[PDB]
């Protein structure tokens, strides 16, 4: 299943944590924090 | 013995022994209620008496699978007013032909000769003049003007957008070198710049943080947010309405009693607005920007007086069923699955509902 | 279960002919007053009369309140019995004549048939549809919701008014919930999740509930008991709509308001429609104003007009006072503490002191009511009080004497346990002697004047 | 119905010859009080005539002498044509507003603005409704309506289709539509379509189809008081305070504007002004501040006639420490003419008891009526009138079809009159709590 | 701290015979009154009988409050004991009658039982999904015992709690599923090192054992007043604490009375009736007394205890006097206890207890002199001199309070009677009842 | 800057056979009128207008109470 | 606390399938008057930064009991970036970049009364109307 266009996902475990960003939000303002703005 | 629900109905119907004879018909319903009161009258989701008009559905068979549910709810109390009063200038604030005062008076009293308009304020902004302080209150002439013309609800919506930046300064500009710095245009907001509430939220030992939440914690810890409601209003009604035979009244009813801006503020941003804001190339501040409707204090009853019958209530509503529940749990631990025989066939259905609640097996 | 001053009173104890049995239903004596209270019960059960006044007149401790509570039991649960003291009338929120009117209309009941017209189902689809408004500044608005409801007998798709979607939204409904929608009010209830997908691993502590059996659209009928005052309060503080006034009116603090005659009159029209529609039975009841001497000349002068109303309950006053000053009218003295204007309106049931053998009977009724098994010499002892001391002092000794007897290991109260109760627990008169003798002069150990 | 039998239910009017103002010895439920009924009829005439503003009349006389009855007779003989406000003087001591504000609102309630307006109303049985709802809604639809005399079809505009769907209008429904507002009231279900109403329970009523044209102009004659216009203009739902109360003190400049506008509507001929009555029951419960306000409120052009009743002799005026007749200050009594009610003769008591025995469903034997008359002389009209109900209830306990002397004797024995009640008090003074608080509970 | 009654720890009676000991549990003397209060105390515990009004009467001091405080200690925490000063009733937010109704209903407990369910486990993983620009949130919790792992879906309310608690993998947490509250118990992993600002490392814990879910029966006691407040309202239940509650309508109470009876028949609730103690009861008005007298008559009325110092004294709100300042038809419903002024050996024993409670080492002669002062100045004054003499003794570094310190305290601080003479000796220089005064030498 | 919708013009009265609409004749005088009105206010009117939002500025006043 | 010298994502070693972007750390530089630090933060701070609209040259603090951040304002080192900008600037924090201090709070019990009986920070319409 392809992930939701606008739910950014945080996951934390023994390895620490990560944030994963939908391909639809890269190139939006919400991508700017991740180095992937417009 | 009989549960109080059984006992009440049984007593009211056995009282008919004094009135009539029919004895067989009565003693049949004795056996009914003494088995379970839901055989006699099913407990079902219920609400206060509605003292209002609504549109009844006249037929189910004619209705079809797609139906429009209009909001039909209206008051039976019904205030007939002529349009001469309600529309054609008997309302002094409503400008139009006839009401020639209202249009002049609105402009001059709210703008021209109104002290809060920026041009008037700007003439009073120095020395001993009545707006001298406005340099040191953090509002601009525009915000002061707005706050003097918008009502308490609209002003409270505007507060929802703002950042308590003077509270953050209390965390940062601490030290003698910081001189407890404050922006000079906020100089008079002393109690915002110096307030334990901000510090108590940042310290890691939450001692004063907890001392400030005592009331809300213990309220919740007492379970009062989850305990069943012990009362509700016996009657409920919608607001009384003007009835006027004009179209302006119908528009103005919708503008006030179903006020779009208040409703939008309470219920928050619309889903397409959330989509536009999240997919936009640059950030945009939504309105309002969040749902300003509070959380309900009762975490289960929320904002309505509708009760749903509990299965625990159903169990205890029959004295036999309440007594049988202990015996069946004993019999379960005795190694027996449920096996019972009934003089009334409909009681088998209630036991299937009971067993599908309990998840014990036949 | 708990035992109180009147737990032994069960009724008026009359014959079918309306004569009083000298000891019945917990009473001893007052027979003429119990017979007069019977004819008042007949006046109430025969709905035909409005605004008749009864005064229970008699000294303190003569069973005036026992008579009023006995009336409340002869009328049974169906008829509204509305008890107040005259000291409840002084509200800080609203004028005291408002509280009287609220109590007058609380004493008139209505039993009314109501049809609730509702939709029930598992939400299987929920799809909002919206418009870009012209620039009102609040932005886009939901124009309608499309919602799919599934019951056991198939399913239906509802295109909701957005006013009802606000009910759905404030109820935090989701797809896969079971909901109840009430088309009377536009109100919504989330009943639960479906029992479908009822997996255990939710932190949400969901109540999974079965799919509604039957048709997805239902039209159940139920019978509601309400007072006229319940309608007044509903229409004065509206809360059953989904409009903004009804919505905010649930967030504001509740406060009483001086409901106008205009509202009350127009609710008479509404209720008379229910009568003519055959959906309501009007069941007028009784207002018991205990301690009616604590009313004032404005209360009494209002009651004149209130009783002349074309509908009003029966009012039963009780007073225990002789010729006394009318409150708020220090110029005026009258019997019972009731204005001479108002006393003319009432039927007075005078109430008389008990004889010593009646006190003995009451003591025995009261003892066995409390479960105090009591010897006959002990009964005679307790009944020497009530003659020499108030009757109430007798009845109050029974519980200490029971405790003392059982602490002494006795199964039953002897004269000894009362004679100890008499010593630990004084009457007012013996205590009044202690005051006058100890406070015979001032000092460090004196009572304060 | 919801009106029960009450103390004044027998009063149907003033009982006066309208051609001459001669009081008939009895009619319309009033007995005797002829001179007082004549004077109240002269007041009634000048109330209806409207030309005279702000006169106060006091009705003065002993208790139970027909003062309220004459007030009720005037209200019954004015009817809906004139505003009639009844005020117990206890009512103005509000916690929401000062008593002069409450007393202003009472004067404002007693002047009517009569406004005459028309609308086209369309009424008939729905033959069918088609609405396409073409996802989307309210796109297009046709309505057929019939009376017994006509049938017509209409294309509906989209905001009318919303109204029809909002009211769940169905084939067979008898509806009225006000055209300019577009509200739909379902007057009922047509009997011929009864079979279609499968969801309606058997308790449902049905109606015959309407008659005449589908559309006609119906004129409505509203009367709205000055107080209602005042309250409407107070706030955005000002009228909502006409029900709940919670009007404040309405600002004087709002009232002054409204008076000017109502003078405009009168001069423009758009509205009539209809002066009513304010009846102040037991006016002596007012205090000296109230009477000072009333004195000049009566001098307003938009003042009703004020009618007042007092039981009181020379008595202490409230809010001061001196005495005056009726308990009313002489400066106020200078502005007031007075009607006196006298005590009743035994035959008038007999007639009032007979009338009261007609209004209650009671048969009195002639000797029971004679005994109640004798009791009425000795114990007062009100007490004997309360023995009527008591005697019927006792008679019904013995299953008697007529009330006999035995039933009246049981009533007299069971229920004390005021005098025997006082005598009982004057004997029981040690058992009753005295004005000193002293009481003896011993036997 | 040490307060006026902190030494009172019970009623000091034999639980079997109700015989008062001459001194125990910090009470001394008053044996007749302490036995009477012990009979009342037992009929409080028995619950069977409603609406008994007991008046404790006596001169000032003589322990009437001390007796009432001894009763409260002997009931423990579970039974309600609503202390009320009669001057609290004169609210501006509600009538005296409503204020009394609330005070009665505060004194009846409803003891409600529920089965909670709780979780106890190590968090192995957390996933949270958040809608950009707010609104919806979603997530999954993976949580572990030595014996189970399971993945629980999380709603927004739980994700708020999880993030407010800053829950992380390796935390040990417990969740009350019924209330939704979370608490971190500790951590099983170390605190990591890859990130800064992770904050405090909580207690090390071994992983919880057994099943994740456990049922937990818990019991909560709430007043009838607390049920009233939340059932008269949709919103604003802080009125339980802020006191914002208005005059609650009687329809709500009538419903609640019916429902609490039904909850008792259902076995959902136990009613636990307690005490309303009205101190200074002579301060009520005639209107208050004519409410209590009939409020007592209800099945849910508490047992009412009162204290009065007053003699034959004026009733407030009326023109006339009565014993205790209480109306006679009120006192008709009252059984009266009389406390008696103490003897010198009773004074000595009380002052020894006060000295021991304040941890003051009196010399025997100082205790004798304080007893002599106690006889003539009063027990409260002689009590006040104990702490005062301790301080004076500390100035001179004395290891015990000597007679010199008590004399020094007696010198510095006047008793009431001596102050009354001081006033009489300076009537020219104090402000009179005429308002006249002379300021000159 | 005051303006009012007087109604719908009755030239559109047959745009449908039924609509929830109020149809009014076209204005029959000049489209423009100029008239001079001598307006009176008082200093108290200026107080009240400046003390608080008045009329349609304060809709939440419909709640009453506070 | 500091002026934000930098914000920079650390790309994760093991990106989540279907997302294409996966960050394992966000690095922030904070400068004070008394020094600056390279700060490695859990990527969840993205939520605070994006809501709070933190930018390089803004003055912020990070509180360790939440891991969230709050923005005081833009550093007055940038007050000349434009001829007009619609915010006031705030000075660079004159303390250390990292504060760990004991703090002693003067409180009365009456302060606890009012703080419990009328909570101050509530974000709903009735709270916010209440505080107006
Ligand atoms: N005739 C009677 N038979 C039995 N009990 C009585 C009788 N009269 C009074 N009592 C009881 O005596 C007590 C006092 O009576 P009460 O009604 O309080 O008198 P009052 O209301 O006039 O002061 C109550 O417990 C009441 O139930
Ligand atoms: N002349 C009369 N004709 C008919 N009924 C009367 C007459 N006078 C008094 N009554 C009735 O007797 C009762 C007492 O008279 P009322 O008018 O109330 O006297 P007041 O107002 O002076 O107390 C009322 O029920 C009234 O209707
Ligand atoms: N019997 C006693 N035993 C111990 N302390 C007592 C006793 N009587 C009084 N006291 C103490 O003396 C002081 C006065 O007694 P208190 O109960 O306040 O009298 P009052 O009846 O005036 O309230 C209090 O500090 C109280 O604790």
Tab-separated table of N, CA, C and O in Angstrom, chain C residues 16 35-36 48 50 52 60 92 95 119 159 257-258 260 263 266 276 298 302 305 308 310-311 320-322 324-325 330 336 341 344-345 347-348 350 354-355 387 390 429, chain D residues 2 4-5 64 68 90-91 93-96 135 168 205 242-245 311 316 318 360-361 382 386 389-390 397 410 415-416 421 425 431 433 435 439 441-443:
chain	number	residue	atom	x	y	z
C	16	UNK	N	-63.128	3.384	53.484
C	16	UNK	CA	-63.754	3.701	52.202
C	16	UNK	C	-64.834	4.768	52.341
C	16	UNK	O	-65.064	5.543	51.407
C	35	UNK	N	-59.367	13.036	58.390
C	35	UNK	CA	-60.569	13.037	57.561
C	35	UNK	C	-60.648	14.264	56.656
C	35	UNK	O	-61.020	14.149	55.484
C	36	UNK	N	-60.315	15.444	57.180
C	36	UNK	CA	-60.218	16.636	56.340
C	36	UNK	C	-59.152	16.504	55.254
C	36	UNK	O	-59.366	16.930	54.115
C	48	UNK	N	-60.915	18.745	38.627
C	48	UNK	CA	-61.734	19.869	38.183
C	48	UNK	C	-61.347	21.212	38.796
C	48	UNK	O	-61.693	22.251	38.225
C	50	UNK	N	-58.880	24.278	40.496
C	50	UNK	CA	-57.587	24.947	40.500
C	50	UNK	C	-57.507	25.967	41.628
C	50	UNK	O	-58.479	26.675	41.910
C	52	UNK	N	-57.276	26.079	44.932
C	52	UNK	CA	-57.802	26.009	46.286
C	52	UNK	C	-56.653	25.982	47.286
C	52	UNK	O	-55.607	25.376	47.034
C	60	UNK	N	-46.336	23.320	67.030
C	60	UNK	CA	-45.233	22.448	66.613
C	60	UNK	C	-45.348	21.050	67.205
C	60	UNK	O	-45.727	20.869	68.363
C	92	UNK	N	-31.308	34.384	45.309
C	92	UNK	CA	-30.404	35.451	44.894
C	92	UNK	C	-30.377	35.678	43.389
C	92	UNK	O	-29.887	36.722	42.947
C	95	UNK	N	-36.301	37.208	41.415
C	95	UNK	CA	-37.282	37.637	42.403
C	95	UNK	C	-38.041	36.452	42.990
C	95	UNK	O	-38.283	35.443	42.327
C	119	UNK	N	-32.878	7.727	12.634
C	119	UNK	CA	-32.089	6.851	11.777
C	119	UNK	C	-30.997	6.174	12.594
C	119	UNK	O	-30.325	6.820	13.401
C	159	UNK	N	-28.110	12.447	2.620
C	159	UNK	CA	-27.493	13.738	2.315
C	159	UNK	C	-27.914	14.721	3.405
C	159	UNK	O	-29.014	15.276	3.365
C	257	UNK	N	-33.818	32.395	35.286
C	257	UNK	CA	-34.265	33.630	34.663
C	257	UNK	C	-35.733	33.857	35.000
C	257	UNK	O	-36.493	32.909	35.210
C	258	UNK	N	-36.117	35.132	35.070
C	258	UNK	CA	-37.475	35.526	35.447
C	258	UNK	C	-38.419	35.319	34.261
C	258	UNK	O	-38.834	36.256	33.576
C	260	UNK	N	-41.168	35.055	31.743
C	260	UNK	CA	-42.273	35.995	31.653
C	260	UNK	C	-43.616	35.269	31.669
C	260	UNK	O	-43.722	34.081	31.358
C	263	UNK	N	-44.309	34.041	28.049
C	263	UNK	CA	-43.892	32.671	27.749
C	263	UNK	C	-44.833	31.636	28.361
C	263	UNK	O	-45.232	30.677	27.690
C	266	UNK	N	-48.134	31.351	26.461
C	266	UNK	CA	-47.994	30.687	25.166
C	266	UNK	C	-47.665	29.201	25.278
C	266	UNK	O	-47.975	28.435	24.360
C	276	UNK	N	-55.692	18.581	22.790
C	276	UNK	CA	-56.630	18.426	21.681
C	276	UNK	C	-56.147	17.407	20.655
C	276	UNK	O	-56.969	16.711	20.048
C	298	UNK	N	-45.335	40.262	50.484
C	298	UNK	CA	-45.268	40.268	49.026
C	298	UNK	C	-45.537	38.888	48.434
C	298	UNK	O	-46.246	38.770	47.429
C	302	UNK	N	-48.812	38.134	46.202
C	302	UNK	CA	-48.686	37.482	44.903
C	302	UNK	C	-49.544	36.226	44.814
C	302	UNK	O	-50.175	35.972	43.781
C	305	UNK	N	-53.087	36.559	43.341
C	305	UNK	CA	-53.205	36.507	41.886
C	305	UNK	C	-52.868	35.123	41.338
C	305	UNK	O	-53.544	34.627	40.430
C	308	UNK	N	-55.707	32.761	41.650
C	308	UNK	CA	-56.785	33.102	40.727
C	308	UNK	C	-56.493	32.698	39.286
C	308	UNK	O	-57.375	32.850	38.435
C	310	UNK	N	-56.323	30.703	35.898
C	310	UNK	CA	-57.247	29.679	35.389
C	310	UNK	C	-56.679	28.268	35.378
C	310	UNK	O	-57.449	27.321	35.179
C	311	UNK	N	-55.377	28.088	35.578
C	311	UNK	CA	-54.840	26.827	36.071
C	311	UNK	C	-53.837	27.118	37.179
C	311	UNK	O	-52.966	27.982	37.031
C	320	UNK	N	-47.362	27.094	62.446
C	320	UNK	CA	-47.342	26.628	63.828
C	320	UNK	C	-47.424	27.772	64.838
C	320	UNK	O	-47.125	27.573	66.018
C	321	UNK	N	-47.812	28.968	64.397
C	321	UNK	CA	-47.608	30.200	65.144
C	321	UNK	C	-48.951	30.843	65.468
C	321	UNK	O	-49.913	30.729	64.707
C	322	UNK	N	-49.008	31.508	66.618
C	322	UNK	CA	-50.232	32.099	67.122
C	322	UNK	C	-50.600	33.394	66.434
C	322	UNK	O	-50.505	33.492	65.207
C	324	UNK	N	-49.117	36.540	65.430
C	324	UNK	CA	-47.716	36.845	65.185
C	324	UNK	C	-47.612	37.967	64.162
C	324	UNK	O	-48.526	38.205	63.371
C	325	UNK	N	-46.478	38.658	64.196
C	325	UNK	CA	-46.203	39.714	63.233
C	325	UNK	C	-45.971	39.129	61.845
C	325	UNK	O	-45.205	38.176	61.677
C	330	UNK	N	-44.234	44.713	59.674
C	330	UNK	CA	-44.133	44.777	61.127
C	330	UNK	C	-45.264	45.570	61.771
C	330	UNK	O	-45.427	45.500	62.994
C	336	UNK	N	-51.875	32.802	62.843
C	336	UNK	CA	-51.114	31.895	61.989
C	336	UNK	C	-49.932	32.554	61.296
C	336	UNK	O	-49.206	31.869	60.566
C	341	UNK	N	-56.210	39.111	54.726
C	341	UNK	CA	-56.662	38.990	53.343
C	341	UNK	C	-56.543	37.558	52.836
C	341	UNK	O	-57.483	37.017	52.243
C	344	UNK	N	-58.682	34.395	54.532
C	344	UNK	CA	-60.042	34.240	54.017
C	344	UNK	C	-60.126	33.269	52.844
C	344	UNK	O	-61.181	32.668	52.616
C	345	UNK	N	-59.041	33.099	52.090
C	345	UNK	CA	-59.072	32.220	50.928
C	345	UNK	C	-58.976	30.740	51.277
C	345	UNK	O	-59.325	29.902	50.441
C	347	UNK	N	-59.177	26.958	53.452
C	347	UNK	CA	-59.860	26.073	54.389
C	347	UNK	C	-58.857	25.628	55.446
C	347	UNK	O	-57.852	24.990	55.119
C	348	UNK	N	-59.133	25.956	56.703
C	348	UNK	CA	-58.208	25.682	57.796
C	348	UNK	C	-58.520	24.314	58.391
C	348	UNK	O	-59.650	24.052	58.811
C	350	UNK	N	-57.475	22.692	61.529
C	350	UNK	CA	-56.792	22.741	62.822
C	350	UNK	C	-56.361	21.368	63.316
C	350	UNK	O	-57.020	20.353	63.078
C	354	UNK	N	-51.606	15.725	71.251
C	354	UNK	CA	-51.871	14.319	71.518
C	354	UNK	C	-52.121	14.069	73.003
C	354	UNK	O	-51.574	14.754	73.872
C	355	UNK	N	-52.960	13.074	73.281
C	355	UNK	CA	-53.150	12.553	74.625
C	355	UNK	C	-52.008	11.627	75.047
C	355	UNK	O	-51.266	11.113	74.209
C	387	UNK	N	-45.363	13.790	77.579
C	387	UNK	CA	-46.284	14.476	78.474
C	387	UNK	C	-45.544	15.613	79.169
C	387	UNK	O	-45.934	16.781	79.061
C	390	UNK	N	-41.487	17.533	75.255
C	390	UNK	CA	-42.043	17.380	73.919
C	390	UNK	C	-42.130	15.907	73.513
C	390	UNK	O	-41.387	15.050	73.998
C	429	UNK	N	-35.373	22.225	77.744
C	429	UNK	CA	-35.730	22.881	79.001
C	429	UNK	C	-34.694	22.642	80.094
C	429	UNK	O	-34.337	23.575	80.822
D	2	UNK	N	-57.440	22.564	29.634
D	2	UNK	CA	-56.360	23.038	30.490
D	2	UNK	C	-56.798	24.158	31.422
D	2	UNK	O	-56.194	24.334	32.485
D	4	UNK	N	-59.008	24.934	34.247
D	4	UNK	CA	-59.795	24.309	35.294
D	4	UNK	C	-60.842	25.294	35.811
D	4	UNK	O	-60.902	26.453	35.396
D	5	UNK	N	-61.682	24.827	36.729
D	5	UNK	CA	-62.628	25.700	37.416
D	5	UNK	C	-61.884	26.523	38.458
D	5	UNK	O	-61.215	25.971	39.338
D	64	UNK	N	-63.141	40.387	49.666
D	64	UNK	CA	-64.244	39.586	49.130
D	64	UNK	C	-65.474	40.417	48.770
D	64	UNK	O	-66.604	39.939	48.886
D	68	UNK	N	-61.699	42.289	42.509
D	68	UNK	CA	-61.087	41.504	41.441
D	68	UNK	C	-62.119	41.028	40.426
D	68	UNK	O	-61.851	41.013	39.220
D	90	UNK	N	-46.583	43.051	43.867
D	90	UNK	CA	-45.400	42.284	44.245
D	90	UNK	C	-44.444	42.026	43.087
D	90	UNK	O	-43.268	41.730	43.327
D	91	UNK	N	-44.910	42.128	41.841
D	91	UNK	CA	-44.105	41.638	40.728
D	91	UNK	C	-42.946	42.561	40.374
D	91	UNK	O	-41.929	42.090	39.853
D	93	UNK	N	-40.752	44.043	42.150
D	93	UNK	CA	-39.546	43.989	42.967
D	93	UNK	C	-38.553	42.988	42.395
D	93	UNK	O	-38.086	42.079	43.088
D	94	UNK	N	-38.240	43.169	41.118
D	94	UNK	CA	-37.332	42.300	40.387
D	94	UNK	C	-35.903	42.438	40.898
D	94	UNK	O	-35.509	43.466	41.452
D	95	UNK	N	-35.129	41.375	40.707
D	95	UNK	CA	-33.684	41.424	40.863
D	95	UNK	C	-32.969	41.716	39.551
D	95	UNK	O	-31.778	42.041	39.568
D	96	UNK	N	-33.671	41.609	38.422
D	96	UNK	CA	-33.098	41.928	37.121
D	96	UNK	C	-33.102	43.425	36.837
D	96	UNK	O	-32.203	43.920	36.150
D	135	UNK	N	-25.322	12.700	-5.475
D	135	UNK	CA	-24.599	13.781	-6.137
D	135	UNK	C	-25.536	14.937	-6.473
D	135	UNK	O	-26.504	14.767	-7.210
D	168	UNK	N	-40.366	17.608	4.304
D	168	UNK	CA	-40.705	16.258	3.842
D	168	UNK	C	-42.118	16.196	3.265
D	168	UNK	O	-42.920	15.318	3.592
D	205	UNK	N	-54.710	11.791	12.833
D	205	UNK	CA	-55.910	12.403	12.283
D	205	UNK	C	-55.758	12.641	10.781
D	205	UNK	O	-54.654	12.662	10.233
D	242	UNK	N	-38.325	38.758	25.436
D	242	UNK	CA	-39.747	38.854	25.757
D	242	UNK	C	-40.311	37.578	26.365
D	242	UNK	O	-41.419	37.611	26.909
D	243	UNK	N	-39.589	36.465	26.285
D	243	UNK	CA	-40.053	35.185	26.798
D	243	UNK	C	-39.301	34.783	28.058
D	243	UNK	O	-39.905	34.621	29.120
D	244	UNK	N	-37.981	34.629	27.962
D	244	UNK	CA	-37.147	34.239	29.090
D	244	UNK	C	-37.082	35.306	30.174
D	244	UNK	O	-36.530	35.039	31.245
D	245	UNK	N	-37.611	36.500	29.926
D	245	UNK	CA	-37.077	37.656	30.602
D	245	UNK	C	-35.632	37.879	30.207
D	245	UNK	O	-35.226	37.625	29.068
D	311	UNK	N	-57.335	46.651	49.466
D	311	UNK	CA	-58.058	46.219	50.658
D	311	UNK	C	-57.915	47.172	51.836
D	311	UNK	O	-58.710	47.092	52.778
D	316	UNK	N	-49.976	52.087	56.865
D	316	UNK	CA	-48.626	52.612	56.702
D	316	UNK	C	-48.175	52.448	55.255
D	316	UNK	O	-48.177	51.336	54.719
D	318	UNK	N	-45.628	51.915	52.398
D	318	UNK	CA	-44.373	51.182	52.371
D	318	UNK	C	-43.227	52.104	51.974
D	318	UNK	O	-43.395	53.043	51.192
D	360	UNK	N	-69.201	25.173	39.217
D	360	UNK	CA	-68.893	23.820	39.647
D	360	UNK	C	-70.065	22.891	39.352
D	360	UNK	O	-71.230	23.294	39.394
D	361	UNK	N	-69.750	21.633	39.040
D	361	UNK	CA	-70.776	20.654	38.674
D	361	UNK	C	-71.408	20.065	39.938
D	361	UNK	O	-71.185	18.913	40.315
D	382	UNK	N	-66.271	33.735	50.658
D	382	UNK	CA	-65.213	32.838	50.198
D	382	UNK	C	-65.243	31.482	50.895
D	382	UNK	O	-65.020	30.449	50.254
D	386	UNK	N	-65.956	27.738	49.286
D	386	UNK	CA	-65.103	26.562	49.432
D	386	UNK	C	-65.791	25.377	50.101
D	386	UNK	O	-65.307	24.248	49.970
D	389	UNK	N	-67.402	22.970	47.103
D	389	UNK	CA	-66.563	21.885	46.596
D	389	UNK	C	-66.434	20.762	47.618
D	389	UNK	O	-66.544	19.580	47.278
D	390	UNK	N	-66.181	21.122	48.877
D	390	UNK	CA	-66.046	20.135	49.944
D	390	UNK	C	-67.294	19.270	50.091
D	390	UNK	O	-67.197	18.046	50.236
D	397	UNK	N	-68.537	10.755	48.264
D	397	UNK	CA	-68.103	9.657	49.124
D	397	UNK	C	-69.281	8.819	49.612
D	397	UNK	O	-69.200	7.586	49.646
D	410	UNK	N	-70.935	18.284	57.536
D	410	UNK	CA	-69.607	17.677	57.561
D	410	UNK	C	-68.525	18.660	57.121
D	410	UNK	O	-67.447	18.712	57.724
D	415	UNK	N	-63.723	21.741	58.258
D	415	UNK	CA	-62.915	22.895	57.880
D	415	UNK	C	-63.399	24.150	58.590
D	415	UNK	O	-64.565	24.536	58.461
D	416	UNK	N	-62.491	24.782	59.332
D	416	UNK	CA	-62.805	25.965	60.121
D	416	UNK	C	-62.793	27.210	59.246
D	416	UNK	O	-61.992	27.331	58.317
D	421	UNK	N	-60.978	29.736	63.295
D	421	UNK	CA	-59.526	29.580	63.254
D	421	UNK	C	-58.808	30.529	64.210
D	421	UNK	O	-57.882	30.122	64.920
D	425	UNK	N	-56.826	29.701	67.679
D	425	UNK	CA	-55.528	30.301	67.990
D	425	UNK	C	-55.543	30.983	69.356
D	425	UNK	O	-54.638	30.789	70.173
D	431	UNK	N	-49.685	26.429	73.111
D	431	UNK	CA	-49.149	25.441	72.182
D	431	UNK	C	-48.656	26.073	70.887
D	431	UNK	O	-47.667	25.613	70.309
D	433	UNK	N	-46.702	28.913	68.774
D	433	UNK	CA	-45.553	29.777	69.020
D	433	UNK	C	-46.000	31.232	68.996
D	433	UNK	O	-46.531	31.721	67.993
D	435	UNK	N	-45.638	35.516	69.409
D	435	UNK	CA	-44.767	36.528	68.825
D	435	UNK	C	-43.476	36.705	69.614
D	435	UNK	O	-42.525	37.297	69.097
D	439	UNK	N	-42.977	28.958	73.535
D	439	UNK	CA	-43.922	27.869	73.312
D	439	UNK	C	-43.647	26.801	74.362
D	439	UNK	O	-42.499	26.579	74.755
D	441	UNK	N	-44.179	22.734	74.916
D	441	UNK	CA	-44.474	21.483	74.229
D	441	UNK	C	-45.061	20.413	75.139
D	441	UNK	O	-45.484	19.367	74.639
D	442	UNK	N	-45.092	20.636	76.450
D	442	UNK	CA	-45.625	19.633	77.357
D	442	UNK	C	-47.140	19.520	77.217
D	442	UNK	O	-47.813	20.406	76.683
D	443	UNK	N	-47.671	18.400	77.698
D	443	UNK	CA	-49.093	18.101	77.568
D	443	UNK	C	-49.950	19.109	78.333
D	443	UNK	O	-50.101	19.014	79.551
